[PDB]
Ligand binder design. Structure first.
Ligand SMILES: Cc1c(C)n(Cc2ccc(Cl)c(O[C@@H](C)C(=O)O)c2)c2ccc(C(=O)N[C@@H](C)c3ccc(C(C)(C)C)cc3)cc12
Lengths: 12, 268
């Protein structure tokens, strides 16, 4: 959830 | 009959590419960590936390990356979580460099990293460990295994499975060139739940597996089945993870909620 938002931002 | 042919040279180029990217993404390498731990570096000798009095001195005078909780066990655990959130960012940066990875479906990139970061955290943590303890604050401190074990329940057993993993894993004597390919293999795992398109992931993994195998053959003349042993570790690692998860739920049930990392507080 947060884990996923952390990752999406990092990939962007 | 191994030959140095075009296909093998491309797998060596792939391995170097990964190595270079791993060096960029992860400031504290295994080579740099082993030099500190063995007293073969000219860099600053880390402060050692081996009991409560040294913890207090360490947090005070030295200032370690760990309204703060009054209890030491919770400050330590929260520090580990915070650092792991930063580790996710480092691991994501590394994943972007794996050839093919960013051409995958974005939802699959996400899912690969979501299920792989805990395994890679524990793999790379072993680089910072010896039989006595673990490097902390990017190598500026060292916290003993026995001090960690002495924390009150439920925190006393939190690092023990990682140390147990590390003793055996470090006995394989992998270097950073080996580890860069290994962690790429773990990320490109086609069996993660909820993946949309498995074959392109498997195709990247197959090439990474080829590169790992060759790396291990060339770099470990005295362990002819090290490749197989490393694949066996990936099978293992899932257990540190399955058991961290159980531990967390005990923690979140029975302890005060602790602070959210700033990045999350910002995300919401
Ligand atoms: C990355 C890392 C380091 C460098 N150590 C050593 C260490 C020892 C003692 C102190 Cl005090 C310490 O202190 C910090 C401040 C520092 O010195 O760097 C650092 C760890 C120990 C445990 C875990 C872990 O078990 N991590 C769990 C808790 C998790 C795993 C994955 C996630 C997400 C994927 C959901 C993000 C969240 C939590 C991770 C680490």
């Amino acid at each position: 959830m947060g884990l996923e938002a952390i990752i999406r931002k990092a990939l962007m | 009959h191994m030959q140095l042919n075009p296909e093998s040279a491309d797998l060596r180029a792939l391995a170097k590419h990964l190595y270079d990217s791993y060096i960029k993404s992860f400031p504290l390498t295994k080579a740099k960590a082993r030099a500190i731990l063995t007293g073969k570096t000219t860099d600053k000798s880390p402060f050692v936390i081996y009991d409560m009095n040294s913890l207090m001195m360490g947090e005070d005078k030295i200032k370690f990356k760990h309204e703060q909780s009054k209890e030491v066990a919770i400050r330590i655990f929260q520090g580990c979580q915070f650092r792991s959130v930063e580790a996710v960012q480092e691991i994501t940066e590394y994943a972007k460099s794996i050839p093919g990875f960013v051409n995958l479906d974005l939802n699959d990139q996400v899912t690969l990293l979501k299920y792989g970061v805990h395994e890679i955290i524990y793999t790379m943590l072993a680089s910072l460990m010896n039989k006595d303890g673990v490097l902390i604050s990017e190598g500026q401190g060292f916290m003993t295994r026995e001090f960690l074990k002495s924390l009150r329940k439920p925190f006393g057993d939190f690092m023990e499975p990682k140390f147990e993993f590390a003793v055996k894993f470090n006995a394989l004597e992998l270097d950073d060139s080996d580890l860069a390919i290994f962690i790429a293999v773990i990320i490109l795992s086609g069996d993660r739940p909820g993946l949309l398109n498995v074959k392109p992931i498997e195709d990247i993994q197959d090439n990474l597996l080829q590169a790992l195998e060759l790396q291990l053959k060339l770099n470990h003349p005295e362990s002819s089945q090290l490749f197989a042993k490393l694949l066996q570790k990936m099978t293992d690692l899932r257990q540190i993870v399955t058991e961290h998860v159980q531990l967390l739920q005990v923690i979140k049930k029975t302890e005060t909620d602790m602070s959210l990392h700033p990045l999350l507080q910002e995300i919401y």
